Amino acid sequence: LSSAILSEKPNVKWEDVAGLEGAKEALKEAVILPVKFPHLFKGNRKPTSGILLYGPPGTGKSYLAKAVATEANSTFFSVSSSDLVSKWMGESEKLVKQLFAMARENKPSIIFIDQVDALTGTRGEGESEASRRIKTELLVQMNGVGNDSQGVLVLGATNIPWQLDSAIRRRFERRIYIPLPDLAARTTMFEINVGDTPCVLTKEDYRTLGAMTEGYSGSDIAVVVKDALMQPIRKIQSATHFKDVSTEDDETRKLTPCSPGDDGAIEMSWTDIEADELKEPDLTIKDFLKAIKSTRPTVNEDDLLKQEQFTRDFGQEGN
Amino acid sequence: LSSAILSEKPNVKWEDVAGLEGAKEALKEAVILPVKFPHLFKGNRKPTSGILLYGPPGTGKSYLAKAVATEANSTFFSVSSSDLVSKWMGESEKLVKQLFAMARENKPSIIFIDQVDALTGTRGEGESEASRRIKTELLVQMNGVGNDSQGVLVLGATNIPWQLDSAIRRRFERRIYIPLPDLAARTTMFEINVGDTPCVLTKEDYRTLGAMTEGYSGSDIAVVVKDALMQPIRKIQSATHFKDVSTEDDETRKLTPCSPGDDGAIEMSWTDIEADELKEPDLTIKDFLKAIKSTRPTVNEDDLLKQEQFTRDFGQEGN
Amino acid sequence: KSYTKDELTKIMDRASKIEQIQKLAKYAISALNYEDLPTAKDELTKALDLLNSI
Amino acid sequence: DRASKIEQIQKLAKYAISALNYEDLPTAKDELTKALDLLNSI
Ligand SMILES: Nc1ncnc2c1ncn2[C@@H]1O[C@H](COP(=O)(O)OP(=O)(O)OP(=O)(O)O)[C@@H](O)[C@H]1O
Ligand SMILES: Nc1ncnc2c1ncn2[C@@H]1O[C@H](COP(=O)(O)OP(=O)(O)OP(=O)(O)O)[C@@H](O)[C@H]1O
């Protein structure tokens, strides 16, 4: 009857998310503040219970969700439009009922629906059969709890707001556009993406890095980082000639890839080199440059047309 | 519930494939390196997650997949987009969910999805029934186990990258163009496809062939090969005049097809003919000549322009 | 530290040049595997002159 | 003879590539030049 859907703990902190922290503010005020100081929400002021994030794919909407999950100290349920919401006939809606029952049962709780648009209908076969009655079930269930007392939060996500029908829109609470990262956000993300690995940590070139990348997503940035990270590895694979660097003051000899002509340039397979004696080329700007070169114009303007149109019309709008 | 997928070994080695050794390297790094040295993935060094193979039909995409499976040294899952389309109209994606569960439970595993431009075709209006739900199911399920602990690699295959949506495009990672073979690659494939037949000699003939046959696929090459191999059988069938060649030191007079005018031309048919006394015609350039006459080019150059356009746009990287 | 931000152009250019040289070398090796000496010579010459120009 | 000379050429190419991988341009130049001269000598 019930069918439990994951409440696992990601480990993504607030600080791992760079950018437009007004959304973060809305989150913290909508979730954490109610928990922390409940007496602030008595009488005619009642806590916000619906939030839905929209924008191009790859912009950490899912990442943001995981951060929220990490930060909530609450039950976090997460489910898609295909996930546990069908049958022969009929009882998907019942499953939805049982779920929201369970949500009420567990205060605080958070329901996260990715790709909320995929639960929509106004004319087709789903409007005749299921998807209408699904939509109706949703609408009715988001009605009464929103009146007066609630320990459930509804979190939406969508790339395509405009294909989600008008019926949900005004009945739902709070919506924010998640744009692609700007210069500063890209730069911060670079720094975050470097972590512990040493050389080069040039603070001055980070801003050049964020400059050079324009319009790319979090995902894209991640990909470029990974791409740069395999460069020393690919060197090693193509490397033959290695040489000692760590002196006898250290525990033992340690070999790194080196120019083929050098005094101490001995040639073998990288597979012969064990982990204790192991050393890797440093990370240069050149590695990152190469990484950028494999990255192309990633994001189509066509997204920007409709996403910026919805932005001009609704945007930071609650909806 | 399970829906049985074969993971057995299609014994096709690296060396049986010709070309794009750089994609081969990416694959070696994507599977083999993880297998060989997993302890190299502490900190910010993390496995590649998804690779799309894109290009014209018939370019050994399936062949490549076989080689991957042979070389993976792990559980390998293979599926066509034909599979798991629908059962009732209601229930499809549960099978996808269960599939991914199975794959997650087998680390390392590799999922190969053929013709990812099917499911996900994509065209509007008609998508809103089950197909949008599927589209969603992909996107959400790739988000599930993706962070931290991965033993899944996703390989897609597509003929039509340009109709695969933005949403998949910059979520699903690394995209690689599989071109038609060039002169070199064709020649190498010719040399690969020989068998026991002594045939026509040297490399000169091979290079002549690979030069002369242009704009054709591995599949097409295979077809031509089979044709040529059957041509002596075709000679045997159509000419009932045969003649002795080998000396009496063998079991008996060894008989091959000849013209009705030929000296020694006996005209009994294949039916009376003993297993030992058999002399197949040698494989000549003329078989390949007639094969070329029979070989028509497959793919229009507009498709080449669209593949080339995508390549100009996204190319040898995911984006 | 120490970066004027106009170097990156030259750097990526020279990197592309290096890549092209590497490609040329590979092609030459391929040509040698096909006992095609003149092609090999031409590709190595083109790599050589490409190397010389920077 | 023509087999070992090709092998030597290949080796020299490999050495040039290693050199380039570590931005040792003069070494690369000299190794490509030796490969080319040797190729001409075949
Ligand atoms: N500060 C950041 N901003 C944006 N994205 C980030 C950031 N840090 C990490 N990421 C990336 O976010 C990805 C998580 O998925 P993401 O949120 O981008 O999907 P999405 O945009 O929600 O699209 P979908 O709705 O299809 O899941 C990770 O793979 C990671 O590389
Ligand atoms: N190096 C190669 N390049 C291209 N094709 C090859 C190569 N080696 C073998 N083949 C051929 O590949 C064929 C296998 O099917 P193939 O992978 O070409 O279909 P496909 O490219 O997946 O097309 P589709 O996506 O329409 O199924 C075999 O008939 C085999 O002869």
Numbering used by the authors:
A (entry chain C), B (entry chain B): 119 to 437
C (entry chain G): 276 to 329
D (entry chain H): 288 to 329
Article passage:
The disassembly of ESCRT-III is mainly mediated by the Vps4 protein that is a member of the type I AAA+ ATPase (ATPase associated with various cellular activities) family and oligomerizes into a functional hexamer with elevated ATPase activity upon binding to ATP6. Powered by ATP hydrolysis, the Vps4 oligomer, promoted by the cofactor protein Vta1 (Vps twenty associated 1), disassembles ESCRT-III polymers into individual ESCRT-III subunits available for recycling. Vps4 protein contains an MIT (microtubule interacting and trafficking) domain at the N terminus, a single ATPase cassette comprising a large ATPase domain and a small ATPase domain with a β-domain inserted within it, and a C-terminal helix8111213. In this study, using Vps4 from yeast, we solved the structures of the ATP-bound Vps4E233Q hexamer at 3.9 Å resolution and its complex with Vta1 at 4.2 Å resolution, both determined by single-particle electron cryo-microscopy (cryo-EM) without any symmetry imposed.
We obtained 3D reconstruction of the Vta1-bound Vps4E233Q hexameric complex at a resolution of 4.2 Å. The structure of the ATP-bound Vps4E233Q–Vta1 complex also contains a hexameric ring of the Vps4E233Q similar to that of the Vta1-free Vps4E233Q hexamer. After docking the Vps4E233Q hexamer into the EM map, we can still observe some clear extra densities located between neighbouring Vps4E233Q subunits of subunit B to F distributed at the periphery of the ring. We attributed these densities to the Vta1 protein. We were able to build an atomic model for the six Vps4E233Q molecules and four Vta1 CTD dimers in the cryo-EM map of the ATP-bound Vps4E233Q–Vta1 complex. The overall structure of the Vta1-bound Vps4E233Q hexamer and the Vta1-free Vps4E233Q hexamer share similar conformations with a root mean square deviation (r.m.s.d.) of 2.18 Å overall Cα atoms. The structure features of the Vta1-free Vps4E233Q hexamer described above, including the loose contact between subunit A and its neighbouring subunits, the spiral arrangement of subunits from A through F and the different conformation of subunit A compared with other subunits, are all preserved in the Vta1-bound Vps4E233Q hexamer, suggesting that Vta1 binding does not, or at least not significantly, alter the conformation of the ATP-bound Vps4E233Q hexamer. The interface of the two CTDs in one CTD dimer is roughly perpendicular to the Vps4E233Q hexameric ring, resulting in one CTD, referred to as inner CTD, closer to the ring centre than the other one, referred to as outer CTD. Vta1 CTD dimer bridges between two adjacent Vps4E233Q subunits in two different modes. One mode is guided by the interactions of the β-domain and helixes α7 and α9 of the small ATPase domain from one Vps4E233Q subunit with the regions around the tip of α8/α9 helix hairpin from the outer CTD of one CTD dimer and the N-terminal half part of the helix α8 from the inner CTD of the same dimer, respectively.
